[PDB]
Amino acid sequence: SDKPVAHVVANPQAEGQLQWSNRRANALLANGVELRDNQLVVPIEGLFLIYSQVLFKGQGCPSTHVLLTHTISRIAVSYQTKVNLLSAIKSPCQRETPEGAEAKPWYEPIYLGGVFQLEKGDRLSAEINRPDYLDFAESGQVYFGIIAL
C-alpha cells in the first residue's frame, strides 16, 4: 500500500545500546518513512499513530535506586527543540537492604503510544536512559513505530 509506516526493533547485535533497525524479521520502513541518525523521519504532513516498547532487565538492587525512563521525542521543522510527546518513568528497586539473599532478576516493560499531528521532515526519537538494562536478546521485546492515519 501507499501508507507511510515504520516498525523497527532493537538490533540484538548492538551490545549496550539501543540501535533501532528495520533489517529484521517482522519490521517495516516504507512509503517515505526513513531511519535517519537512529530517529524516524516523517515523509508527509498529517496525523500519525506513534508508539514504542522497551524491556528492562537487571537483578538484585545493588545500591543506587535506578529510575527507568522511556520517551518518544519530536524534533520539528529541521532540528528545532526536543520535546517529549510520550513519557513514562519506572523504578525497579525500592529495597536493597543488608544481609540475606541476592540477585533476584527483575523485568520492567514500558509502552508508549499516541495520535499526533506531524509536519514534513519532523524527527521522532524513542529513547531510554538505561541502555545497559535493555533486554533485546529476544524478539518483540523492544520496538518503535508509526503509521499515517
Added chain:
Amino acid sequence: SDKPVAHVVANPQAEGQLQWSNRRANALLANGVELRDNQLVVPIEGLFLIYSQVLFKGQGCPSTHVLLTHTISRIAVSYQTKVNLLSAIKSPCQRETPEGAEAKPWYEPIYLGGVFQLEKGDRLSAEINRPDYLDFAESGQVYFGIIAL
C-alpha cells in the same frame, strides 16, 4: 484530515486533580470531538481507537498499601450508565513497616488502549482513583486520546 480526533493531556495547573485539556502543545481536539465535562464526546457512529496513559509518583510508602487504578468508561445514548471499556490496576507498595531509613520515590505508569464501536453522542471517561499520586508535572506523561478508524 476530516476524521474526528482527540489527544488531550492533564492540565499541569489543576490543583491536585486530573483535568483533561487540549490547550497544551502537541494536543488535539478536531472534526467534532468535544471536551465536555472532562469527558470526550463522539460526534458520530463508527470504529474508534481510544487510548490513555497516567503516571504515578510518590516518595516512600507510609505503611499501608495503595492500589492505583485507571479506566476508560463508556456512557452511551443520552446519559446511560458507565461501563468499563478498558481497565487496569497496579500495586506500588509491596512492603513497608520496620524502620531503618526513609525516602525512595517510586513511579508507576499504566497504559490503556483498544478499538471500539460507538454511537454519535457517547461520551468517554478516563478516571484514576488517586489524583494525589498523579505525576502530570511535565512531558507527555498523562494523556487521553481517540481517533476514528
Added chain:
Amino acid sequence: SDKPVAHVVANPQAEGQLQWSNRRANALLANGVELRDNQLVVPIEGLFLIYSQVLFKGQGCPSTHVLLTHTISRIAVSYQTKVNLLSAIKSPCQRETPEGAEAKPWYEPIYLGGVFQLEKGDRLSAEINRPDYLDFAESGQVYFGIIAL
C-alpha cells in the same frame, strides 16, 4: 465500518483459563476476522494494528519468584512455525518473608501493541504463562484486538 476488525475479551465463565470471546458487550468480531482455536484469523493481507492487555493478580508469593510473560505471536501459511510479534516479561515478586509479613495481593498489568504486515489465513495468538494468575474479575482488564489500516 467495512474494515476487518476484532476486539475480544477474556470470557469470565472460563475460570482459570484464557479464552477469548466476542460474546460480551463492547466486543467485536467483524468483516472477515475469525476466532479459530482461540486465535484471531486474518481474512486478507494488509497492515494491521495489533494489541492486547492482560492483568495478573496474586496473593503474596510464599517463597519462589514468579515470572509473568505476555506475547502476541504470528503463525503463517497454516499451522507453520511461531514467531513473537510482541512480547513483554514481568516479575511480581522480588522478596519472600519468613514470618511477619502476610500474603499481600499484587497486580501487574501488561500492554502490548504494534503494526504488522500480515497475510490472509495468518493466525495470531495472545498468550500468557500463568492463567491461574489472570484477573478478568471486572470488565476491560483482559482483551485482544486487531484492525486493518
